[PDB]
Every structure is written in C-alpha cells, then in structure tokens.
Amino acid sequence: MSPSDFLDKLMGRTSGYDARIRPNFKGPPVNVTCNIFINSFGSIAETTMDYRVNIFLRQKWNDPRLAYSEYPDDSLDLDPSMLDSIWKPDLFFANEKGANFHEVTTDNKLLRIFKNGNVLYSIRLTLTLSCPMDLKNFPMDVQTCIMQLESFGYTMNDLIFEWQDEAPVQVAEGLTLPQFLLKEEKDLRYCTKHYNTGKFTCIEVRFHLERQMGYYLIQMYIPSLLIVILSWVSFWINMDAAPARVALGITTVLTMTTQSSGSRASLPKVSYVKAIDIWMAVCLLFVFSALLEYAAVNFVSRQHKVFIDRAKKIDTISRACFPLAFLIFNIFYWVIYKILRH
Amino acid sequence: MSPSDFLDKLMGRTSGYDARIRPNFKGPPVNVTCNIFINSFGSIAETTMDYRVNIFLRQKWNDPRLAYSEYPDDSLDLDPSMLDSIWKPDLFFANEKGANFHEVTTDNKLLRIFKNGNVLYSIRLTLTLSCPMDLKNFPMDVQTCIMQLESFGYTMNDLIFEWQDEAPVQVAEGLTLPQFLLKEEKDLRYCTKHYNTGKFTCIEVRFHLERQMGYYLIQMYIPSLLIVILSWVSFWINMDAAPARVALGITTVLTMTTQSSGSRASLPKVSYVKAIDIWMAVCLLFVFSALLEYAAVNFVSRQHKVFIDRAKKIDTISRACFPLAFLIFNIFYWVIYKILRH
Amino acid sequence: MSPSDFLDKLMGRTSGYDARIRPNFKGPPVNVTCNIFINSFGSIAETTMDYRVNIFLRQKWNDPRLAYSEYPDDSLDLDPSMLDSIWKPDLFFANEKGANFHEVTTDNKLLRIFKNGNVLYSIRLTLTLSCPMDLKNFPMDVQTCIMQLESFGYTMNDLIFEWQDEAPVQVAEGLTLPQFLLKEEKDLRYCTKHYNTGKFTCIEVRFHLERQMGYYLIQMYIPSLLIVILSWVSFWINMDAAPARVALGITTVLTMTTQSSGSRASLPKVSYVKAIDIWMAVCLLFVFSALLEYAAVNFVSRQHKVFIDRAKKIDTISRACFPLAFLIFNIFYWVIYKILRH
Amino acid sequence: MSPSDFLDKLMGRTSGYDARIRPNFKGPPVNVTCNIFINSFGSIAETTMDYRVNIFLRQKWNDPRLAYSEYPDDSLDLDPSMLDSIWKPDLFFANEKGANFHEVTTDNKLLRIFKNGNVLYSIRLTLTLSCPMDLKNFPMDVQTCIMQLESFGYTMNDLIFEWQDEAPVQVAEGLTLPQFLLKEEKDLRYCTKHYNTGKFTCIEVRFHLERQMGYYLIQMYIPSLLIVILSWVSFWINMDAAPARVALGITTVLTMTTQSSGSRASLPKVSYVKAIDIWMAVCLLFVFSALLEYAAVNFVSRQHKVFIDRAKKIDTISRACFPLAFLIFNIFYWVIYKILRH
Amino acid sequence: MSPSDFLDKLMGRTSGYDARIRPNFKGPPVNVTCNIFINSFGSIAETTMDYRVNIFLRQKWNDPRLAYSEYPDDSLDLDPSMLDSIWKPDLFFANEKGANFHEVTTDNKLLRIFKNGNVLYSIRLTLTLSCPMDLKNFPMDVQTCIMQLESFGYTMNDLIFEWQDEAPVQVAEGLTLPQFLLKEEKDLRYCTKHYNTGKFTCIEVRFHLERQMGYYLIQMYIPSLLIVILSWVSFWINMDAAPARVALGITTVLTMTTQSSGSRASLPKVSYVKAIDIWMAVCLLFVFSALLEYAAVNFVSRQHKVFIDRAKKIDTISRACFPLAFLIFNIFYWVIYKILRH
Ligand SMILES: *[C@@H]1O[C@H](CO)[C@@H](O[C@@H]2O[C@H](CO)[C@@H](O)[C@H](O)[C@H]2NC(C)=O)[C@H](O)[C@H]1NC(C)=O
Ligand SMILES: *[C@@H]1O[C@H](CO)[C@@H](O[C@@H]2O[C@H](CO)[C@@H](O)[C@H](O)[C@H]2NC(C)=O)[C@H](O)[C@H]1NC(C)=O
Ligand SMILES: *[C@@H]1O[C@H](CO)[C@@H](O[C@@H]2O[C@H](CO)[C@@H](O)[C@H](O)[C@H]2NC(C)=O)[C@H](O)[C@H]1NC(C)=O
Numbered sequence A, B, C, D, E: 001m002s003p004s005d006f007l008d009k010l011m012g013r014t015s016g017y018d019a020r021i022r023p024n025f026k027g028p029p030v031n032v033t034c035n036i037f038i039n040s041f042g043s044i045a046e047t048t049m050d051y052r053v054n055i056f057l058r059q060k061w062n063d064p065r066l067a068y069s070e071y072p073d074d075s076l077d078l079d080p081s082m083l084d085s086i087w088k089p090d091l092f093f094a095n096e097k098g099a100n101f102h103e104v105t106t107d108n109k110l111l112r113i114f115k116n117g118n119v120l121y122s123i124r125l126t127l128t129l130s131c132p133m134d135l136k137n138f139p140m141d142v143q144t145c146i147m148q149l150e151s152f153g154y155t156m157n158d159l160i161f162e163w164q165d166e167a168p169v170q171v172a173e174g175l176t177l178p179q180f181l182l183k184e185e186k187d188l189r190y191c192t193k194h195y196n197t198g199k200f201t202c203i204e205v206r207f208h209l210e211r212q213m214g215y216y217l218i219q220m221y222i223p224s225l226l227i228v229i230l231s232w233v234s235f236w237i238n239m240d241a242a243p244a245r246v247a248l249g250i251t252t253v254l255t256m257t258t259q260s261s262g263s264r265a266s267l268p269k270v271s272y273v274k275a276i277d278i279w280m281a282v283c284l285l286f287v288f289s290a291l292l293e294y295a296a297v298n299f300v301s302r303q304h305k306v307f308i309d310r311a312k313k314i315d316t317i318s319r320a321c322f323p324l325a326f327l328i329f330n331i332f333y334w335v336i337y338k339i340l341r342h
C-alpha cells in the first residue's frame, strides 16, 4: 500500500483527526523533548547588542491518535507541504529579533511518525538573538549569551518543555570567532514564567564567551608604557639643556595624544568609562607631570649655590620617585582587573 | 463537542456573521483597551532619526454577536490561519517607518473569545519608529521618543482607543543601551487628530532618554584642559629662550589640532554647532593666544632698561591673567549647560 | 440591507462591471485629482544620490457605473482584500528606485464610493526617489529634489492627472534634518512626456534644500585662518633665530597638513574639486610660501652692511604684504560663492 | 464587444492556445527585437565589483496564433494578472547578481497584441550586474561595464535575439555619477555561447566610464610636491646649523608620513600596487634621501681646509642634482600613464 | 500530439505516478551525478567569516517510471510551474547561511526527460557559504573555502551523490578578486556523515586562495624600514649636539607611532597577534632603544679624558651593532613566514 494513501486514511476527515486539538486534550499535559545542534556562531555586535546563529531544532512528543498497526513499516514520513494537517507545539524564542526558515532546493524540514505514535520533528532555521553586554572592563571581560525556548499560548497544565538527557546542545567542530572564545561548558536552566494567566513553560541555555588580549597587549599597552618610560629620560639630561628637555617633554605628550587618538577608531562606542580609558588617562597624566617637573626645576635655578642645589635635589628625587609610583599604579590596576573579575 | 465545530457554528454563513461590519453598527462606538509590553529597545541612530523596538500588543473589546451559552467552556481559542473571519480594529502606528510580524515555528498571534463576548487579541511585532533629535547640547542632551497608536478609517463616533488603568506600558528588566539611559517614568497622552472628515482616535506614550557623560569627560574635556594648562608654562620660562618657548607654543597648538581631529571621527555628523565644538574652539583660541603673547614679548625686548622692564611686566601680568579668564569661561560654560537645560 | 451585499449587487457578474475597462470608455478622458501628505523626510545620501520619504497618496475620480440611489447611506466602504474588483489608475513614480506598502495590523489602504459615483482612494507607502546632486560649492550649496507622478500605459486622451487647488502637498510639522533645511515653498509643474506612442500625463513637485554652515565655519574655516595667522609671526622674530623660525614654519606646515587630513574623513567622496578644497589648497600655499620667505632672507644675509639691509627690507615688506594678499583672496573667495550662487 | 471577452475567445480552451508551445513550433526560429532604456545608473563599488541600474526592457515578436480580424480595434491590451496565459521568451541576464520587478500602485508591466499578431512586451525592473575592475592605474583608469541578454533553454534554431536598428540603448538626460563619467558611445556585440547542447543566442552592450582627476590632483599630488620642494631648502641653509637642518629634514619626513597615512582612508582597498602608491613611495624616498645628504655633509666637515671644501661641494652639487632627478622621474611617470594607457 | 498532453498522460492520476516515492523504492539506491558551474565569486569578509557565490547546479538521475516510447521526440521539457509533480532529490548545502533562486523574466530552472527515463535538472541560485579563517600570518596567508552538498533525510541505502567524471566544477573566465587570488586546482572529497540514524551522502569541493602582498610591501614594510634606518643616523652626529640628537630620536619615535596608527584603520579586526603586528612592535622597539643609547652616552660624558673615550666607544660600537641585529631579526622573521608556512 502507498504510504501517502495510508497517511491520508490516518489523518483524513474519515479518521476525524483535528490539528487544532492537542494530544490528550482531557488529561495530562504534553511533554516535549528538545535538542539543539549549532552549525554556525558569530556576528556578535555591541552597537545592536545581538548575535547570529544557525541551528538544527528537534522536538519529540507522543500523539496517541497517530498510532498504527496495519502498515508493516515501522516509520512513516510526511510531506513538508502538508505539515499544516498535523498538530505541532507553538514554540518560539523569547529573546529573538529576527528569524527565517531555509528553502534552497527542497524545504529544510522533516517529520516522522512511529508505530507507537511518537513524532520526531526536525527543522533548520537562522536566528538573531539579543544579548545585553556590559563592556565595563572591556579588554578583560566575559559575556554570557542566552537562548530561551518558550510556548506562546499554552500553560503548564497543557504543555511542558524538557531538555534531553544525553546531549541537548551540541556545537560543530572548527568554529572560530574573530574576537571571542566560546567555552565548552554550557548551562541548562528552567526559567519558568509566571503571569496573570498562569505558568508558562520555558527552558534556557547559556554560553560563556571570553575575549582574547594579544592584539590589545601588543598594540596599546606596550607602546604607552614605552612612551611613559621615554618621558623619564629627561631627568638624566643636564638641567641647562632647555631646548632639548622642553622639546622632548612636549613631543612625548604629542606622541601620547596621537597614540590615544589612533586607538579610538578601533574600539566599541559607549558613553561610559572603560579600563583601557583609565589606563590611557593615567599615562597621559604621567607624561603631563613630567613636563611640569622640569618647569619647576628651571625657575628655581634661574632665581638669583643654595638655589642650584635645590634644583638638582628635585631631579635626583624624581629619578626614583616616578618609576615607583608608576609601578604601584600598575600592580593596583592589574590585580583589581585580573582577580576582582568574578 | 469540538471547539472548532462550535466556532464554525458561531461564525459561519448560517450564523450570518459579517467580518466587515463593526460591533454595535447602529449605536455607540467600540471601546478598545490597549496594553504594550516592550521586549527590546535600541538601535537609536541620528543619521536616520529612528529607533527599533520589539513589543507585545494586546487589544480588548466586546463583540455582542460572539456571545455563547451552550458550550461549557468559559473561553475559546481561534486558529491564527482563520483570523480573517473575525472583525478586528484597524490600528496602525503613525510615526512608523517599517514593521513586520513574527512567524518562527508557529505564527506569533493569539485570539480568545469569552462567554460574554469579550475578545482578547495579543500579537508580537517589530517596529522602526522615527524620532526627531536636536543634538544642540550634544554631550549633555535629553531626547524624547514617542509612539502613536491611531485608527486608519474610523472616526470618534465609531472607534475609541483607551489605555489600561493598571499598567499600559511595561519594559522587560535587564535592558541596556550603549549610549543612553531609559528613565522609568512614562507619559500617557491623548493626541486626537482633527481633519476635514472628523476626529480620529489616537493615544501616545513618551520615553525619556539621558546620555551618559563619563567617556566624553575622560577622553575629550580632560586632555584639552591639560593641553591648555601646558600652554601656560611658557610664562615661567626665561624670555631669552626663544627656541624653547616658540617650539613649546607651536607644539601645543599642533597637539590641540591633532586631538580635535581625532575626536571628530567618533561624533554625530550634523551641520550646526554643538557644545563640544564651542569648547574645542575656545581651547584652540587660548592655545593660539599663548603664542602671540610671546611674539609680542620678544619684539619689545629686542627694540633698542625701560624696554626690558615692559617685556617682563607682560609676562608677570599674563601669569595670573590667563588662568583667571579660563576659569571665568569654564564657570560660564558649565552653568548654562547644566542649569539652563530644562 | 448589508453594505457588503449591496456592493456585491453593484459590482458583481449580474451587474456586469468590468475592472479592466476605464470609466467613459468611449468619450472624454478620466480626470484624476491628487494629494500628497508627507510624514517623514530624510536619508539623503550622495553616494547613491537618493532620499527616502513616507507619504500619504490620495486620488479622486468619477465612475458613472458606480452610481447608486437605493441605499440610504451616502457613502460606502470597500474591503482592502477585494480592491482588485474595481478600476484604479495605473499611477507610478518615474524617478523611483524602491517602494513598498504597509501591512502592520490591517493593510493601510482605503476606498470610498459616494452616491454620485465619485471614488476616493487613499493609500500609504514608502519611496526611495533618486535626485542628482552637484556639490560643486559643497559648503554653500542648494539642492532640488523632485517627485514625478506618471501613468504607465494610458495616453492623454484616456487619462489626465491634475493637482488639487487647495493644498496638493503638505508636510507634517516638527520634521528635522541632520544636514539640510527644507524650505516651505514648493513648486507644481506639468512635465508632460512626448513619445512615439503619444503624450503621457505627468505632474511634478519640487523641494528646495539648503545646507547649514555653522559646523563647517567653526571647525574648518576658523582653525585654518588661525594657522595662517600664526605663520605670519615669523616676520616679527629676529633674523638670527634660525632654529626658532625654521621650526615654527615647518611645524605650521605640519599642523596645516594634519588639519586637512583630519577634515577629509567627514566629507562627501567625489572626484572633482570643491570650494572647501580650494580654500584648503590656498591656505597650504600660504603657509608654504612663508617658509621660503625666511629661506631667501637667511641666504642673502650670510652672503659676504648693504647685504644686511636688503635682508631686513624683505621682512619689513612681507610684514604688510602677506595679510593684504590674504585679505584680497578672502574677499574674492567669499563674494563669488555668496553672490554668484543663483 | 468586450475586449476581455474577445481575448478570452482568442486564448481560451476552445481556441486551444498553448502557452508552453513557442510560435512556429515546426519551422523557423522566433526572432525577438529588444530595446533598453536606462533610467538610473550608479552604485559602482569595487569591494563587490558590481553596479546598479534601473531600466525599461521592451521585446517584440510575431505570434501567428494571435492574429485576429473580427474586432474593429487595431490593438488589444492584456491584464498583467493573466500574463501567464501567453507565451513569452525566457530571457535572463547572464552577469546578474540580483533583480526584482516593481509593484508600486499597479504592476509595472504592459503587453499589447496587434491585428497581424505582433506582440509588444514592456516591463520595468532593477538589476545588480557584476563588472570586474582592474584599478592598476587607479587615478587614471578607464573601466568597461557590460550587460548580457541570454536565453535559458532555447537553442539558435528556436530563439534568436536581435538589437533594434534605430536606438537599442538610450540613457535619460541629467544622470550624474559621484566618481565616474559615462561616455556617450556604446557598443552592440554578438556574444553567442557555444556549449555541448548547442548554440545559444546572446547580445551584449558595453559602457565606457572615465574617472575624474581634479580632487586627486588638488589633494594628493600637489601637497606631496610641495613637501618635496620644502625638503630642498636645507641645501641653502648654512652647514653649521645642525639643530635647524636636522629638525627640518625629520619634520618633512613626518609631514610626508602623515599625508600618506591620511590619504589611505579614502582609497579603494586592494592588495596590489597602484600608481598613486608608486608616487607616494617615490616622494617618501626623496624626502628620506634629503636627510642622509646632510648626515654625510656634517661628518666630513667635523673630520680633522680640504675637508671644509669637500663638504661644501656636496651641497652645491645637490642644489642642482635633486630637482633634475625629480623632474626626470616626473616626466617618466606622467608619459607612461597618460600615453601608454590604451 | 501536444507534449504537455503527453506529459499529463505520463504523470497524471491515471498513470498513478507518486511524487513522494523515490525511484526504485524497493531495491537499490538512487545515484545522482552533480555538476557545478561558478559564475561569480567574491564578497569575502572576515567579520562574518563567509563568501558569496552565484552558481549553476545540474543533477542527473534515472527514473524508470518516466520511460516512454510512443512519442517520436527524444526529449521532453517540463514547465517550471509544475515542478512539484515530479520527484526530486532533497539536496541542501551544509555550510550555507543564506540562499535564494532567480526569477527575473521567467524562473531560472529547467527539467528534461529522455526516452530511457533519465532526468536532467539544471537550476541557478545564489549562496552565502561560511568559511573559518585563521589570519595568524595575515600578510602571508592561504585560506581554504569549502562547499558541501548533502541530503536532508535520505540514508546511503536510498540516495547517493557522486561527482561527474569529466568536469564537476568549472569557473567562468575573467573573474577577479580585490584581495585574493583563486588557484586553478580544486579538490573533490567524500565527507560522508555518520549519525545515529545512519550514513548520509555528502560530497565536497575545496578552493585555495592566496593573498597578494604588493600593497602591504610598498605601504607598510618599506616605510618602517626607512624610519628604522633614519633612526641610525644619530650615531654619526657629534655627541655635543643634544638639541639635534634628542629631537631627531623623539621625532623618529613619533613618526613610527603615526605610521602604525594610520596603518591600523585598514586591517582586519581580530583579538590575537599577527605577523604585521610583530613587525610593527619590533620596529618600535628599535627606534625606542636608539634614544636610550644617546641618553646613556650624554650622562657618561658629563660625569666629572677616560670618561670622554668611554662615551665615544659606545657610539662606535652601536654604529655597527644596530644594523647587524636588525639584519638578524629580518632574516629570522622572513624565513619562518616564507618557509614554515605549509
Ligand atoms: C508528562 O510528564 C509529567 C511529569 O512526569 C507526567 O505527570 C506525571 O504523571 C505520573 C503518571 O505516571 C503521575 O504519577 C505524576 O503525579 C504526574 N506528575 C504530576 C506533577 O502530577 C505526565 O503524565 C506526562 N504526560 C503524559 C501524557 O504522559
Ligand atoms: C464606549 O465608551 C463610551 C464612553 O464611556 C460610552 O459612551 C457613554 O455611554 C454612556 C452609557 O452608559 C452614556 O451615559 C454616556 O453619555 C456616553 N458618553 C458620551 C460621551 O456620549 C459608550 O457607550 C461605550 N460603548 C459601548 C458599546 O458601551
Ligand atoms: C476631464 O477634463 C477635461 C478638461 O476640462 C474635459 O474636457 C473638456 O470638456 C468640456 C466639456 O464640458 C469641453 O467643453 C472641453 O472642450 C474639453 N476640453 C478639451 C481640451 O477638449 C473632460 O470632459 C473631463 N472628463 C470628463 C469625463 O468630464
């Protein structure tokens, strides 16, 4: 017998199957088991606070009205064009901003019915899910991206969503990200919603992303430290070398400003302060104070042996004072961003 | 009895229900109560003057032709595919530039009919609403974003829109914005339209957004002030140090110009003047005048004891005159932008 | 009687109404009166030469086959889903690159039929209309944007388009533009097309846009003038101060180049010369000549009393010669761009 | 008689017209004459190698099965909704990456049938056609854009495409391009394809685009030449002026680097060398050699009358040697890019 | 006889053809032979890790139920509108993020049936395929782009995909890429998938892309080397020339920083270190050490004949030491990136 003809007998008007009535309409709720396979992951943007995924979604549930025993085959396949003749759960993604299905060649959907009445429903789709980001410690920050699966109009006494026991969420190997690193550990939660109407089923997954630091370390932190160090060689130059010392100080200030201005074009645009901003401001303050040191030294010396000793004392003190304060600032800055980060 | 079969009897040709005829076609107008739940908020742009939202819209009204008493159930659910068989209000958003519905998995729409005839209609959609912006005080500015709900072809004697009493507008917790802060207070208005045809119902909501200032303060205002201060140390250098003083002045001017040029790439593009532009121009004028001070001083001295006293008097006067004028400008600038802002 | 049932009798097969036959098929042409209400205006781009509008379009014409007298009501409303059962003009926008209708909630369309047979047809749509731009005087330029309404396949002996007498075009209050100013005066034209087939009806509107100048004046013209002025203080420095004068000249040249390079990132990208480009080049030429003046002066002096007088004469002449030529250039530049602009 | 009723008799089941059978199914092939009218032209990009057009396409062919003599009218118009009931050629654009039709108001399509059986089919559509570009001589380059019209599944013994004799291709007046100039001369070709199946008809048009040079000349070539000239004034300064000469040389190098860095942001991004790159590198090499000249001169002089003569000889030789080599390079560079360009 | 009427007899209800039943439903699997012709290739982006293609896909398989002998014609063509009445393989692209078909003029699809029952199915479509990239050696890197063809719901005992023997993959001549070079060699693989359900057929192709180096060599590597060389001329200047030597060193540092900042805007944005970053950092370290050399030399000399000899010894050693270390670094850097690259 034709499988299509058998499916017609199973789900036609003579059978009386109603696609708008859920299975077990009188008694216990329907239990749906879900799996997610992630094919691609990326397009993480802070201007819109969202990311893009391409996933495989599989749902399994039992429909006692679809049980059959006459047909020898143990499974039956349904045409994607007739999927509206069967009951399906009204799943939707809560934090979703855009989605679509895939139609290249044939429609990317599959539905299978077994002898006992179990239904397997696997579909492929692309999502744009929103995720808030903090960026308060931007060079050293960890972000969490979630994905919520919810029912639209069924309460907990009608529909229940559960994760699989073996492997709910899997990620294809070889995926890379230009800016982040996706950790292998994932969390499965129960974010049940409580409204006036009642409780609504909802399951959640969490992804942890860590940002790499090599480019920032080699392109922003090291040159700033080198410029700050170069600003210290003024204290080792003779005090009667004003056209050299003043020029060196002002050119170090200019170099610091050009470095900071160049670094701004390749950073996220936010209105609040970040750790790299704090570092940049402190380096600018250091190279700014280095010039006032020599300004104070030149005035005291010109004032008319005691005067020329006091001017030299300031240089000898500064030679050891400036690196010590810089080191104290460095250790304070690094411990609170590499330890106080959980 | 099947709920779908009962709905067919209620809204079929035998019943004679007409979807193109509003409820109470002869007498009083229809009253519609509206709720809005905001899921996401962002994508605020000044180039296009618009923002993006993802909302839940709920409408409630009474239809006496849909009252039923035979069916034991107190509520009935309608299939989203047959929503064209029932009368719905012709609501639309007046300041909308783009909208779409959501179809991932099942269509994201719901319609419920109660025994007395009340109808609940909840749908999910994404909007692109336009909002004019001023940006005349750009670092310290407050913007207001509105959302207008209007009827397309029904006058006030046929259709009336009202807000809920309990909670018209709600916002999901945890929403963040890269540039603005959304205040918790919202306004509900009655922006009724008066045309030649007649009065048309319209309700409005207002959102207040405040821009943060930490990044601008730490990256634009402070370095400019530091450069202006550095330009003042020329007055404390010996007047016979022309290769030092001239070089310091011209390098401070160059540093100011590089800072201003670097800051321009990360600002909104408008054709009118802003407060940050005023600040930048004043700082440039100060560092420009500092060099002319020394130009005047070098000429008077070379002219051939009275001459060398007059040159020193200018330096001694400038040492106190320049910071005083800068302080006066600072307090004048800050009070009119932090007080005269309502 | 049901209005829908009456409309069925009026426009059914028993009536014999044909939607593919224009009114007055044998005799005089159909006269259509048009109104346009503009809701939003913006997204003006020079890379693609186009702008975006959101408008309300209303058309009115008389159909003698739709006259009715039995029904007491003075007006009848047609369902948007059945709009294909009535004859409508084949209007289209000639300079249009993209358009779409609005479907949020219900379709944004309306059709009304009166007793005498008059038809009112109001619809809402979004356009992307193309407009060529010159940008030859870019800081001080006026652009004109047009909007053409044309018939696709009807000649002047079948279809005629006319503007309203009272108010063809209206603009909603409160619209702002980030770069331009929209003048309140509009033009109504008759841009009838003449082809081999015959004359085709076409009406036109014109919008005048003026660009603001405050940002450009405060950020490009003033700093360049300040740098040019700073380049003149070399003539007031002692001629035996080569490490000061040469450094000041070359640093002014460098500052001019940095200002010009920074200003380029925020300007329209075209391949022809603009007024701001002319100004930038002239300022660079001035600061370039200022250094050659001192180069000539240093050589004549070293050559071995008559020689040291000739060198001083050049400085004394230049002190008055350079600002005079700059002033002459300034007045010549400004009069031809603020007067010869119509 | 109704024209629609006559068309029904002409192309109904009683007539037996088959839309899947080409005219003259047994004998000679069908000859189709094509016209193209271009409404807009632009959006030329090198990152994607494509351009955008909005055109009117007209096709004419003879169908002997559609000849009529009973109806007095000499022409008949077909409804755009019933265009699938008639045979049309399967034309498509070979180098097309994206296309769509226009539906604002009514569908922008037209089909007319004459008494002898001739068919006129005019439609409006938007294309995104791909064009490879070289950019090897980027400031002075000419690009050619093509447009291929091909049949999908008909060989030369079934379908033949021909251009019109009078005016195949026309361009609307007033079109402007921000970067290129469209020449008035166009080419018509026969790019017939030869495959295993057989010969397939294909016609081609070519457009020639020339890039303007005013902006590049006034903003890149002239300032570089001015900086190179400024680097030559070191040879006219006294050899015992090291803090002036060294500073002038290094500042000219820095100015050259800043100019080159600023110019890079507004150029096409390719991985191969361009003429502007060659010019930039040569200018940098010149300003680099100018400093080594003075480095060599200072060492020879300090070495301890014969020594001080040799140092002066180098300066006197360089004063004439450097501009001569620069002039030779200039004429060599310009002749091979303005003559060897065909 | 009409070919459409013959096709109706062949694939109608009287024939009993079922489009949901694969050929040879009881026995051996179906063998499908595939060809791919690439029309365009480009839009390679590292922010989204994907590329765009426009291809022709051809599939051939044998259907014994479609064999015919009555009709004299050796081939029959099927209408694209009725393609759902025939069985087609459920091919899909595994690494695909977006796809669409082409409808300009007629639909771009073709299906032919021969006498023995063979089916030829050629269609045109556009893809957006994802490809991970490394960019760890960014100036000198080779990337591989794949394209996977897979079945959605058929195991290896039902459906098998094979490449053609003669020419599976062909590329149109004249294709260019702004950044890469496409090698002429391609690979054909068998990437069969093993799941819990069973084995699924899958074929793969690989494309090798090489990045050109001319622009990077002429714009980044050469100027950095020139600046490093210019930093070495300090060792040939007299040690008592502090205002010259210090200024030259600090200006070389500033020039290096400006070059590095300018080069950053035109590079891919990643968070890990690249070869160009390593080169930039080493050049900055060299120009940084050159200034400390003179700082050490000036202090030793001022300390108060033995002292003035030790200071000169450092300069004489550095004159040969610095270029030697630079050369060693250069050869080490180039051999490990031009040899250790496979
Ligand atoms: C769906 O799962 C729930 C949870 O296991 C089932 O509800 C339980 O059913 C068992 C019967 O074996 C009862 O003993 C439990 O008390 C039920 N749980 C609760 C909280 O009441 C439910 O039966 C399942 N649905 C179906 C159709 O089997
Ligand atoms: C919709 O609301 C309006 C406003 O309350 C109702 O109009 C009023 O109806 C009451 C009857 O209880 C009258 O006493 C008032 O005079 C009415 N207001 C006005 C301004 O005339 C209207 O009845 C409501 N619609 C329905 C169907 O109940
Ligand atoms: C549409 O408008 C035109 C222009 O007014 C009408 O044509 C005129 O009709 C009057 C009749 O009252 C004649 O006296 C004029 O000579 C006509 N103008 C021309 C140029 O011939 C036309 O009648 C209108 N259409 C309809 C249906 O009334």
Ligand SMILES: *[C@@H]1O[C@H](CO)[C@@H](O[C@@H]2O[C@H](CO)[C@@H](O)[C@H](O)[C@H]2NC(C)=O)[C@H](O)[C@H]1NC(C)=O
Binding pocket: D024, D028, D029, D030, D031, D160
């Ligand atoms: C389409 O055009 C071709 C080319 O002119 C026609 O083929 C020619 O027909 C004439 C008959 O007048 C013959 O004398 C020529 O020998 C034909 N050319 C070739 C190359 O064989 C063809 O007849 C035209 N199609 C129709 C339907 O008229």
Ligand SMILES: *[C@@H]1O[C@H](CO)[C@@H](O[C@@H]2O[C@H](CO)[C@@H](O)[C@H](O)[C@H]2NC(C)=O)[C@H](O)[C@H]1NC(C)=O
Binding pocket: E024, E028, E029, E030, E031, E160
């Ligand atoms: C599809 O191709 C496969 C592989 O060649 C065919 O399977 C083989 O069929 C031959 C019969 O000529 C057997 O001798 C081989 O043992 C088969 N291979 C295996 C691995 O069992 C298959 O018959 C082809 N399908 C059709 C419909 O002809």
